[PDB]
Amino acid sequence: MRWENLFVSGVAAWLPPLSTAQDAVMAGLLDPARSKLRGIESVTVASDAEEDAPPRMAARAARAALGRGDVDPADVSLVLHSSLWFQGIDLWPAASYVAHEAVGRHVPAFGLAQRCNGGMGAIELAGAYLGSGIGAGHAALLTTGDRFAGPRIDRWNSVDVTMYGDGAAALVLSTRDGFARVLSTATGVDNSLEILARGDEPFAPHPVEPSPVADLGTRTVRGAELADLPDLTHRYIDLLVAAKTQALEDAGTAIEDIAHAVIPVSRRGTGHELHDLLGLPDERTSWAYGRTTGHVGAGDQYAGLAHLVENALVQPGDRVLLFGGGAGYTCTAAVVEILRMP
Amino acid sequence: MRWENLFVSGVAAWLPPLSTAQDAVMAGLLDPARSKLRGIESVTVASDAEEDAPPRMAARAARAALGRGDVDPADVSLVLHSSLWFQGIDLWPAASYVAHEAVGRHVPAFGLAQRCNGGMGAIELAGAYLGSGIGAGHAALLTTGDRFAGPRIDRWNSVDVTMYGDGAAALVLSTRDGFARVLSTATGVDNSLEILARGDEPFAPHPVEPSPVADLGTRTVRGAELADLPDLTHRYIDLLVAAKTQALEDAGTAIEDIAHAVIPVSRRGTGHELHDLLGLPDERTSWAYGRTTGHVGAGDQYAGLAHLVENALVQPGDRVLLFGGGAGYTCTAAVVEILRMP
């Protein structure tokens, strides 16, 4: 999609303090071979106090993003809140709370699920809503938030390719104006890969109690055995490349013209990483940052963009690739152009 | 919102067998006084076999709805799957499963959370998306699905105002043609009521294990107190009336021109009901149907419309009010004109 009239007006993360991989190793929580292989130096870890429940971290991130863009809460016509896991109370609309705390009473709010890609997919959905004439305002608030805890989540081991960080991020879109122009978005998708996110886990009628520790790595191997696909790796490569190619082409931009790619926090540790597939070096991606925070739910792309702008790592005239990807397997990419520095 | 080119192409529900409140009472699961007060005759109850997990009921409803409007799966550019509760496997994109099984590999799929309003809210998000030019196809697949089980859910008691029903529903939107046209949609919202849906429940770091039985009736009562608003009742009334007024207005239609309203399944057995507020008699609502299914998660409106349509209880030229409402507190309403009969 080529966007004629879409902007990023504000962006921010609320992250708790860093907890090092060295300390996880020393506490016997993390095998050092694994620490080294995945490259993640630290992840963000919140307290178990109620103030750090994911909808409250998101509320704080949303307020910071709205304040940094000087968008008026009264002009926000939509709230989308993306997440991966428990928001702290069940049978309850977390998104309305985020909306109520950061924007107010009369804004439609939805919870959004597209695993790790929710942050990015929310941009397409919000952008479409803002163009439609359904709501009066010119802006949409997009939030993410998670806080991982045990017994179910082991942040250091429950997913093979990454380690989970706690926290929230926020991105405000406008059809009016912003510090960055969204040139394009594009989604690559291959839903046959959903099986890799369930493996041979049975469909239970109720959550399994005492929760065993999640092992999404083991799921992918049972899933790949079950799927019996001849081109499994090629499926994943093709959707990632379709997203990259279409975002860049719709934006009249080549990869050589991308100053920075903000990417999901994940790592193989040997062989080809996502940057090799994208066609740019390691140091032109958000890796140096993401490896200090871990995979902050659906929020890596917002957080990484906030890192860039806050640390003046881009200037006007630079273009940035925001690159998603989450189990499903769905990947939404965007090309943004820096117009001015807040 | 007035809609110039939005249609309903297919609608379907996949519903498991009913189970009567009488049999609930005799089995010692429901007080005879409650059963009588609420007037719900029966409710849909799925088996606990894997094949009745909600995403799989949703895939089947989706396939029935796609068949009924002769929509080619290749022309579907979005899948939105709304639910209230557990989909059978955690840390996993149910929506990509519903999309893969009913449509194919290459359509972006999202899970939506807007409690009981999800079915109706999705109509607006999907309508905007179809109109935006993001995807090449002209159709959206909207699904709902849930299957309640204990120890967390007691379908007969966990909500004062209704009794939960298992099952799924599916609604296919199109921007070129359908058996019915969407004349209007409108959303009334008041996110201050979110507190009514969490009571004094604290934010927990991890889901509370052993699950105690949910009790949303008590949440409403503790929430109301904590909130200590003087006009709690009026907030709820104005957002409902506002959804009604704007839908009717944007569709150029007065309430006495609405041949049927499909409403959420619920009831206070005395005083004003929703039909009184909407200004139409009980008999011109879906109540006579809904009291035999119970509250089918976010799918009451899709299911009730399928019922109207499959039994030829409306005719070409009839206008129907679809009326949402879910905790948050968000109410999306829609006026639909039927152009022919599938």
XYZ file of C-alpha atoms in Angstrom:
684
model
C 0.000 0.000 0.000
C 1.268 3.476 -0.878
C -0.059 5.965 1.658
C -0.779 9.485 0.362
C -1.786 10.912 3.721
C -0.443 9.065 6.756
C 2.031 10.117 9.399
C 3.634 9.010 12.608
C 2.988 11.805 15.042
C 4.349 10.330 18.309
C 6.167 7.241 19.528
C 7.339 5.991 22.907
C 8.133 2.977 25.065
C 7.660 2.452 28.795
C 10.153 -0.217 29.810
C 11.087 -1.437 33.283
C 14.702 -1.917 34.419
C 17.226 -4.162 32.684
C 17.941 -7.620 34.048
C 21.182 -9.065 32.646
C 21.750 -12.438 30.914
C 24.890 -12.798 33.076
C 22.657 -12.797 36.206
C 20.225 -15.332 34.655
C 23.215 -17.585 33.959
C 24.551 -17.191 37.496
C 21.141 -17.898 39.006
C 21.017 -21.164 36.885
C 17.991 -19.867 34.941
C 19.818 -19.719 31.621
C 22.399 -22.066 30.123
C 25.459 -20.037 29.079
C 25.745 -21.782 25.680
C 22.306 -20.521 24.952
C 23.100 -16.996 26.302
C 26.040 -16.710 24.010
C 24.262 -18.201 20.968
C 21.234 -15.896 21.135
C 23.299 -12.725 21.738
C 20.708 -11.124 24.035
C 22.644 -9.260 26.740
C 19.720 -8.141 28.912
C 15.952 -7.977 28.899
C 13.517 -5.647 30.536
C 11.819 -7.058 33.633
C 8.926 -5.411 35.548
C 7.985 -5.773 39.232
C 4.940 -7.907 40.095
C 3.202 -4.853 41.632
C -0.084 -3.837 40.120
C 1.305 -0.569 38.757
C 3.345 -2.591 36.232
C 0.415 -4.625 34.888
C 0.583 -4.470 31.066
C -2.447 -2.145 30.530
C -0.896 0.370 32.937
C 2.538 0.307 31.323
C 0.706 0.799 27.970
C -1.264 3.731 29.477
C 2.024 5.403 30.390
C 3.551 4.644 26.971
C 0.415 6.057 25.246
C 0.584 9.267 27.276
C 4.241 9.776 26.436
C 3.617 9.135 22.698
C 0.651 11.550 22.680
C 2.608 14.230 24.592
C 5.653 13.916 22.333
C 3.552 14.505 19.206
C 1.397 17.230 20.685
C -1.694 15.238 19.579
C -4.818 16.122 21.592
C -6.476 13.010 23.125
C -9.800 14.440 21.948
C -8.617 13.949 18.279
C -7.962 10.198 18.661
C -10.753 8.238 16.912
C -9.475 4.689 17.661
C -7.395 2.691 20.073
C -5.774 -0.622 19.120
C -3.939 -2.502 21.924
C -1.794 -5.460 20.835
C -0.359 -8.133 23.071
C 0.877 -11.713 23.335
C -0.156 -12.741 26.828
C -2.136 -12.147 30.050
C -3.134 -8.564 30.767
C -3.657 -9.155 34.522
C -7.456 -9.618 34.791
C -9.486 -11.978 32.583
C -12.929 -11.616 31.109
C -12.264 -7.845 30.876
C -11.524 -5.406 28.012
C -7.922 -4.250 28.678
C -8.069 -2.025 25.575
C -10.907 0.128 27.052
C -8.812 0.719 30.132
C -5.822 1.822 28.081
C -8.173 4.029 26.035
C -9.836 5.424 29.166
C -6.539 6.254 30.909
C -4.719 7.844 27.919
C -7.458 9.133 25.535
C -10.830 9.212 27.401
C -14.352 7.923 27.490
C -15.728 8.043 23.990
C -13.113 6.341 21.781
C -13.667 2.799 20.308
C -10.958 0.461 21.599
C -10.060 -3.069 20.417
C -7.653 -5.682 21.709
C -5.623 -7.026 18.800
C -3.965 -10.414 18.316
C -1.432 -11.134 15.606
C 1.312 -12.468 17.900
C 4.589 -10.536 17.493
C 3.249 -8.700 14.365
C 0.410 -6.993 16.151
C 2.276 -3.686 16.466
C 2.867 -3.540 12.752
C -0.444 -4.962 11.551
C -2.219 -2.460 13.728
C -0.793 0.259 11.444
C -2.606 -1.048 8.362
C -5.846 -1.505 10.236
C -5.648 1.916 11.958
C -4.649 3.613 8.719
C -7.668 2.162 6.942
C -9.945 3.253 9.742
C -8.524 6.821 9.647
C -9.171 7.155 5.917
C -12.729 5.824 6.035
C -14.704 8.687 7.524
C -16.223 6.498 10.294
C -14.736 8.566 13.156
C -14.323 12.336 13.483
C -10.699 12.569 14.721
C -7.498 12.545 12.658
C -5.415 10.280 14.920
C -5.303 6.698 16.112
C -3.497 5.447 19.212
C -1.724 2.080 18.882
C -0.392 0.399 22.054
C 1.388 -2.799 23.046
C 1.939 -4.264 26.458
C 3.018 -7.489 28.167
C 4.435 -8.698 31.438
C 5.673 -12.265 31.414
C 5.620 -14.370 34.568
C 5.951 -17.900 35.686
C 5.001 -20.706 36.010
C 3.773 -20.487 32.313
C 6.354 -18.128 30.865
C 10.068 -18.654 31.321
C 11.392 -15.475 29.686
C 14.849 -16.969 29.126
C 13.780 -20.315 27.533
C 10.081 -20.424 26.533
C 10.920 -19.400 22.949
C 13.946 -20.775 21.102
C 14.776 -17.765 18.845
C 14.363 -15.040 21.517
C 13.922 -13.983 25.121
C 10.964 -12.013 26.365
C 11.162 -8.521 27.845
C 8.419 -6.816 29.849
C 6.999 -3.429 28.860
C 4.760 -1.338 26.678
C 5.129 0.836 23.562
C 2.905 3.331 21.796
C 2.655 4.832 18.290
C 0.248 7.566 17.256
C -0.896 7.832 13.657
C -2.380 10.930 12.047
C -3.817 11.810 8.630
C -2.938 15.410 9.380
C 0.811 15.553 10.108
C 3.673 14.122 12.052
C 7.438 13.926 12.434
C 7.594 10.981 10.023
C 5.608 10.227 6.871
C 4.425 6.667 6.387
C 5.215 6.123 2.758
C 3.955 2.543 2.569
C 2.914 -0.606 4.349
C 2.806 -4.223 3.161
C 1.956 -7.578 4.625
C 3.408 -10.960 3.710
C 1.434 -13.901 5.093
C 1.427 -17.692 5.019
C -1.206 -19.090 7.375
C -0.132 -22.719 6.762
C 2.617 -21.903 9.267
C 0.093 -21.620 12.142
C 0.856 -25.290 12.935
C 4.392 -24.308 14.031
C 2.883 -22.199 16.820
C 0.793 -25.112 18.195
C 2.903 -28.231 17.480
C 1.021 -31.306 18.695
C -0.532 -29.452 21.622
C -4.098 -30.730 21.994
C -7.126 -28.389 21.901
C -8.155 -28.341 25.604
C -11.612 -27.338 26.750
C -10.077 -25.203 29.551
C -6.638 -23.712 30.281
C -4.373 -26.404 31.708
C -3.859 -25.927 35.467
C -1.129 -25.723 37.296
C 0.286 -24.175 34.065
C 3.335 -26.081 32.847
C 6.214 -23.974 31.539
C 5.648 -23.028 27.871
C 8.077 -24.361 25.279
C 7.352 -22.779 21.947
C 10.635 -24.216 20.568
C 9.398 -27.770 21.077
C 6.101 -26.812 19.437
C 7.829 -25.775 16.181
C 9.592 -29.123 15.877
C 6.361 -31.187 16.511
C 4.626 -28.809 14.142
C 7.186 -29.244 11.397
C 7.076 -33.087 11.780
C 3.252 -32.922 11.585
C 3.041 -30.433 8.681
C 5.353 -32.547 6.528
C 5.920 -29.640 4.143
C 8.661 -30.002 1.506
C 9.499 -26.254 1.498
C 8.878 -25.148 5.101
C 11.885 -22.797 5.291
C 11.118 -21.415 1.836
C 7.575 -20.552 2.919
C 8.929 -18.387 5.708
C 11.618 -16.788 3.476
C 9.046 -16.005 0.761
C 6.581 -14.172 3.002
C 9.406 -12.104 4.568
C 10.754 -11.163 1.151
C 7.223 -10.331 -0.181
C 6.690 -7.910 2.740
C 10.132 -6.275 2.205
C 9.802 -6.012 -1.608
C 6.246 -4.637 -1.603
C 6.881 -2.090 1.201
C 10.005 -0.794 -0.551
C 8.495 -0.726 -4.082
C 5.260 0.983 -2.919
C 7.518 3.599 -1.209
C 9.738 4.217 -4.251
C 12.687 3.194 -2.053
C 15.426 0.555 -2.440
C 17.131 -1.147 0.523
C 20.335 0.830 -0.196
C 18.286 3.983 0.600
C 17.147 2.624 4.030
C 19.158 4.296 6.810
C 17.855 1.920 9.499
C 15.680 -1.202 9.756
C 13.846 -1.638 13.059
C 13.359 -5.424 13.429
C 11.887 -8.029 15.770
C 14.234 -9.009 18.515
C 15.214 -12.559 17.654
C 18.390 -14.396 16.698
C 19.609 -17.638 15.150
C 23.263 -17.169 16.255
C 24.757 -19.177 13.376
C 24.265 -18.729 9.638
C 21.779 -16.335 8.060
C 19.924 -13.827 10.211
C 17.022 -11.589 9.183
C 19.439 -8.822 8.130
C 21.047 -11.099 5.499
C 17.514 -11.720 4.106
C 16.703 -7.971 4.188
C 19.998 -7.122 2.405
C 21.647 -4.731 4.881
C 24.320 -5.098 7.543
C 23.740 -5.841 11.218
C 24.637 -2.260 12.309
C 21.995 -0.792 10.023
C 19.316 -2.672 12.081
C 17.935 -2.134 15.627
C 19.865 -5.215 16.924
C 22.248 -3.218 19.163
C 19.174 -1.879 20.918
C 16.877 -4.933 20.893
C 19.506 -7.154 22.361
C 19.434 -4.925 25.515
C 15.642 -5.128 25.905
C 14.662 -8.579 24.649
C 11.484 -9.192 22.678
C 9.075 -6.728 24.230
C 5.895 -8.494 23.070
C 4.252 -6.874 20.048
C 6.234 -3.657 20.716
C 9.729 -4.039 19.287
C 9.113 -1.882 16.252
C 7.543 1.030 18.199
C 10.261 0.830 20.840
C 13.031 0.662 18.273
C 11.628 3.656 16.404
C 11.462 5.584 19.691
C 15.126 4.635 20.344
C 16.107 6.045 16.949
C 14.306 9.356 17.333
C 15.105 9.936 21.030
C 18.842 9.354 20.477
C 18.929 11.475 17.271
C 20.173 8.464 15.214
C 18.232 9.713 12.186
C 17.694 13.156 10.728
C 15.267 14.667 8.238
C 15.461 13.055 4.852
C 16.396 9.633 6.242
C 14.112 6.651 5.528
C 13.459 3.882 8.013
C 12.051 0.368 7.536
C 9.831 -0.910 10.275
C 9.753 -4.710 9.922
C 7.366 -7.055 11.763
C 6.799 -10.800 11.817
C 4.968 -13.072 14.219
C 3.628 -16.585 14.428
C 0.650 -17.222 12.096
C 2.862 -16.412 10.164
C 2.186 -12.759 9.321
C 4.689 -10.010 8.620
C 3.785 -6.349 8.134
C 6.546 -3.958 6.951
C 6.431 -0.124 6.631
C 8.673 2.559 5.060
C 8.721 5.846 7.004
C 10.496 9.098 6.121
C 11.835 11.455 8.764
C 10.459 14.930 8.129
C 11.591 16.713 11.319
C 12.963 15.816 14.756
C 10.710 16.202 17.825
C -21.339 6.087 9.148
C -23.386 5.972 5.935
C -21.955 3.256 3.622
C -22.129 3.688 -0.149
C -20.720 0.235 -1.106
C -20.730 -2.312 1.711
C -22.773 -5.520 1.443
C -23.370 -8.741 3.383
C -22.551 -11.618 1.037
C -22.972 -14.610 3.348
C -23.947 -15.309 6.944
C -23.781 -18.584 8.905
C -23.646 -20.085 12.362
C -22.142 -23.394 13.428
C -24.000 -24.286 16.630
C -23.699 -27.391 18.864
C -26.794 -29.031 20.523
C -29.000 -27.143 22.918
C -29.208 -27.968 26.595
C -32.227 -26.733 28.536
C -32.290 -24.650 31.697
C -34.842 -27.226 33.010
C -32.230 -29.954 32.774
C -29.694 -27.491 34.299
C -32.069 -26.980 37.319
C -32.666 -30.773 37.783
C -28.891 -31.357 37.618
C -28.420 -28.751 40.444
C -26.491 -26.276 38.271
C -29.118 -23.464 38.212
C -31.518 -22.090 40.845
C -35.166 -22.520 39.769
C -35.862 -18.823 40.610
C -33.031 -17.590 38.407
C -34.059 -19.901 35.556
C -37.571 -18.481 35.688
C -36.497 -14.841 36.147
C -34.221 -14.775 33.148
C -36.522 -16.630 30.770
C -33.734 -18.310 28.815
C -35.181 -21.627 27.702
C -31.944 -23.244 26.621
C -28.387 -22.693 25.580
C -25.885 -24.216 23.127
C -23.344 -26.618 24.650
C -20.489 -28.115 22.600
C -18.825 -31.477 23.412
C -15.287 -31.275 24.849
C -13.743 -33.054 21.807
C -11.001 -31.247 19.955
C -13.189 -30.853 16.858
C -15.454 -28.457 18.711
C -12.673 -26.087 19.791
C -13.835 -22.569 18.916
C -11.492 -21.923 16.001
C -12.701 -25.172 14.377
C -16.402 -24.347 14.874
C -15.513 -20.929 13.380
C -13.792 -22.484 10.342
C -16.966 -24.510 9.654
C -19.312 -21.529 10.066
C -16.898 -19.592 7.787
C -17.099 -22.232 5.067
C -20.940 -22.293 5.266
C -21.103 -18.500 4.947
C -18.588 -18.337 2.058
C -20.577 -21.020 0.169
C -23.943 -19.208 0.637
C -22.827 -15.989 -1.102
C -20.641 -17.696 -3.742
C -17.584 -15.763 -2.604
C -14.326 -17.075 -4.045
C -11.813 -17.532 -1.160
C -9.201 -15.829 -3.374
C -11.216 -12.548 -3.131
C -11.044 -12.408 0.703
C -8.373 -9.888 1.831
C -8.942 -9.934 5.572
C -10.076 -12.299 8.299
C -11.119 -10.958 11.719
C -11.972 -13.507 14.429
C -13.612 -12.098 17.625
C -14.022 -13.999 20.852
C -14.540 -13.686 24.585
C -12.374 -16.531 25.907
C -9.929 -19.413 25.561
C -9.532 -20.771 22.043
C -8.072 -24.163 23.191
C -4.335 -23.572 22.782
C -2.505 -20.529 24.233
C 0.394 -18.511 22.786
C -1.039 -19.258 19.377
C -2.840 -17.344 16.581
C -6.304 -18.886 16.392
C -7.243 -16.309 13.765
C -4.557 -17.634 11.362
C -6.044 -21.149 11.855
C -9.604 -19.909 11.003
C -8.161 -18.122 7.967
C -6.081 -21.080 6.774
C -8.953 -23.580 7.068
C -11.747 -21.407 5.601
C -9.846 -19.157 3.115
C -6.185 -20.095 2.497
C -2.552 -19.316 3.112
C -2.259 -15.682 1.969
C -4.892 -13.588 3.769
C -3.949 -11.470 6.853
C -5.853 -12.614 9.904
C -6.353 -10.856 13.283
C -7.888 -11.853 16.563
C -10.251 -9.123 17.944
C -11.249 -8.434 21.550
C -14.173 -6.123 22.151
C -16.034 -8.489 24.449
C -19.628 -9.122 23.453
C -19.351 -6.247 20.881
C -16.670 -7.884 18.750
C -18.911 -9.170 16.012
C -20.360 -5.742 15.338
C -17.173 -3.693 15.864
C -15.412 -5.871 13.278
C -17.936 -4.794 10.634
C -16.564 -1.236 10.902
C -12.828 -2.147 10.930
C -13.275 -4.593 8.009
C -15.481 -2.138 6.093
C -12.728 0.483 6.365
C -10.042 -2.002 5.374
C -11.948 -3.164 2.255
C -12.436 0.454 1.200
C -8.781 1.481 1.710
C -7.020 -0.276 -1.207
C -4.611 -2.233 1.040
C -5.741 -5.692 -0.244
C -6.658 -6.608 -3.862
C -9.795 -8.562 -2.870
C -13.348 -7.359 -2.369
C -14.403 -9.475 0.648
C -13.703 -9.751 4.323
C -14.381 -12.841 6.451
C -15.609 -12.008 9.982
C -15.889 -14.854 12.514
C -16.751 -15.402 16.176
C -16.216 -18.449 18.334
C -16.200 -19.608 21.955
C -16.734 -22.727 24.098
C -17.075 -22.136 27.790
C -15.997 -24.715 30.346
C -15.343 -24.850 34.011
C -13.887 -24.539 36.532
C -13.456 -20.867 35.314
C -16.819 -20.478 33.448
C -20.200 -21.543 34.802
C -22.379 -20.835 31.737
C -25.544 -20.682 33.924
C -24.289 -18.239 36.551
C -21.058 -16.461 35.631
C -23.012 -13.438 34.287
C -26.106 -12.125 36.043
C -27.786 -10.832 32.837
C -27.262 -13.801 30.499
C -26.211 -17.427 30.171
C -23.365 -18.341 27.872
C -23.821 -20.473 24.741
C -21.073 -22.301 22.827
C -20.602 -21.954 19.093
C -19.413 -19.848 16.227
C -20.815 -17.535 13.564
C -19.436 -16.053 10.362
C -20.353 -12.967 8.253
C -18.766 -12.224 4.905
C -18.665 -8.554 3.913
C -18.248 -7.365 0.340
C -17.873 -4.055 -1.463
C -19.338 -5.253 -4.786
C -22.506 -7.278 -4.015
C -24.330 -9.398 -1.479
C -27.801 -10.630 -0.595
C -28.078 -7.636 1.812
C -26.652 -4.086 1.825
C -25.139 -2.403 4.894
C -26.850 1.048 4.931
C -25.172 2.286 8.088
C -23.038 1.454 11.081
C -22.498 3.510 14.279
C -20.654 3.017 17.594
C -21.535 4.465 21.044
C -18.839 3.996 23.659
C -18.066 4.880 27.262
C -14.784 3.448 28.395
C -15.398 4.657 31.964
C -17.627 1.543 32.383
C -14.562 -0.720 31.988
C -14.348 -0.818 35.804
C -17.730 -2.616 35.844
C -15.990 -5.522 34.092
C -13.085 -5.951 36.563
C -14.787 -5.146 39.913
C -12.197 -4.956 42.744
C -10.229 -7.807 41.055
C -6.535 -7.099 41.412
C -4.111 -7.198 38.562
C -2.261 -10.487 38.947
C 1.165 -11.221 37.421
C 0.027 -14.708 36.287
C -3.466 -16.153 35.687
C -4.964 -17.238 39.037
C -4.524 -21.019 39.324
C -6.774 -23.231 40.434
C -9.303 -21.021 38.583
C -12.133 -19.984 40.803
C -15.521 -19.704 39.158
C -15.984 -16.385 37.333
C -18.705 -14.134 38.745
C -19.262 -11.084 36.509
C -22.470 -10.161 38.356
C -20.421 -9.386 41.471
C -17.803 -7.573 39.418
C -20.541 -5.213 38.202
C -21.608 -4.516 41.858
C -18.086 -4.000 43.316
C -17.088 -1.966 40.230
C -20.135 0.280 40.453
C -19.293 1.035 44.128
C -15.614 1.724 43.583
C -16.448 3.962 40.596
C -18.893 5.965 42.763
C -20.385 7.808 39.780
C -23.740 9.526 40.229
C -25.048 8.812 36.736
C -23.831 5.259 36.114
C -27.181 4.189 34.656
C -27.343 7.230 32.334
C -23.914 6.698 30.836
C -24.953 3.206 29.805
C -28.336 4.463 28.467
C -26.868 7.384 26.399
C -24.220 5.293 24.603
C -26.926 2.730 23.646
C -29.403 5.435 22.539
C -26.579 7.188 20.626
C -25.684 3.978 18.737
C -29.379 3.520 17.889
C -29.978 7.118 16.843
C -26.958 7.466 14.627
C -27.444 4.066 12.873
C -31.108 4.826 12.156
C -30.258 8.344 10.991
C -27.291 7.482 8.785
C -29.520 4.804 7.130
C -32.336 7.283 6.519
C -34.655 4.953 8.417
C -37.055 5.494 11.375
C -37.553 2.770 14.004
C -41.097 2.015 12.744
C -39.491 1.067 9.373
C -37.235 -1.565 11.009
C -38.843 -4.985 10.391
C -36.572 -6.799 12.883
C -33.776 -6.040 15.386
C -31.188 -8.711 16.273
C -29.928 -7.986 19.771
C -27.558 -9.435 22.306
C -29.013 -12.332 24.298
C -29.639 -11.029 27.819
C -32.491 -10.122 30.123
C -33.452 -8.471 33.382
C -36.759 -10.224 34.060
C -38.583 -7.045 35.180
C -38.486 -3.319 34.520
C -37.245 -1.922 31.231
C -35.575 -4.297 28.742
C -33.397 -3.339 25.793
C -36.440 -3.472 23.432
C -38.125 -0.675 25.448
C -35.040 1.568 25.013
C -34.804 0.726 21.260
C -38.472 1.683 20.899
C -39.657 -1.535 19.324
C -41.772 -4.429 20.613
C -40.217 -7.675 21.882
C -41.725 -9.611 18.958
C -39.791 -7.563 16.456
C -36.548 -8.632 18.191
C -34.411 -11.796 18.028
C -35.296 -12.638 21.683
C -37.524 -15.656 20.743
C -34.495 -17.174 18.999
C -31.759 -15.972 21.412
C -33.410 -17.433 24.456
C -32.927 -20.895 22.846
C -29.160 -20.403 22.137
C -28.068 -18.247 25.097
C -25.334 -15.656 24.531
C -23.060 -17.136 21.832
C -20.006 -15.011 22.726
C -19.545 -12.206 20.120
C -21.727 -14.012 17.541
C -25.325 -13.214 18.654
C -25.828 -10.739 15.883
C -24.416 -12.898 13.058
C -26.255 -15.946 14.348
C -29.563 -14.108 14.734
C -29.305 -12.673 11.240
C -28.587 -16.160 9.797
C -31.706 -17.390 11.612
C -33.841 -14.586 10.107
C -32.439 -15.274 6.664
C -32.467 -19.110 6.602
C -36.129 -19.302 7.745
C -37.309 -16.529 5.382
C -38.523 -14.425 8.337
C -37.588 -11.234 6.385
C -38.143 -10.376 2.699
C -36.487 -8.204 0.002
C -36.831 -4.505 0.919
C -36.887 -5.182 4.707
C -34.520 -3.272 6.918
C -32.977 -4.971 9.910
C -31.218 -3.401 12.919
C -28.198 -5.392 14.141
C -27.492 -4.190 17.698
C -24.227 -4.766 19.543
C -23.113 -4.067 23.084
C -20.306 -5.472 25.192
C -18.407 -4.616 28.384
C -15.862 -1.769 27.915
C -18.555 -0.412 27.250
C -18.910 -0.368 23.447
C -22.009 -0.708 21.301
C -21.823 -1.000 17.527
C -25.112 -0.964 15.594
C -25.891 -1.451 11.924
C -28.914 -1.099 9.642
C -29.013 -3.744 6.896
C -31.430 -3.783 3.904
C -31.993 -7.144 2.263
C -31.896 -6.948 -1.541
C -32.725 -10.592 -2.365
C -32.796 -13.994 -0.612
C -29.922 -16.609 -0.835
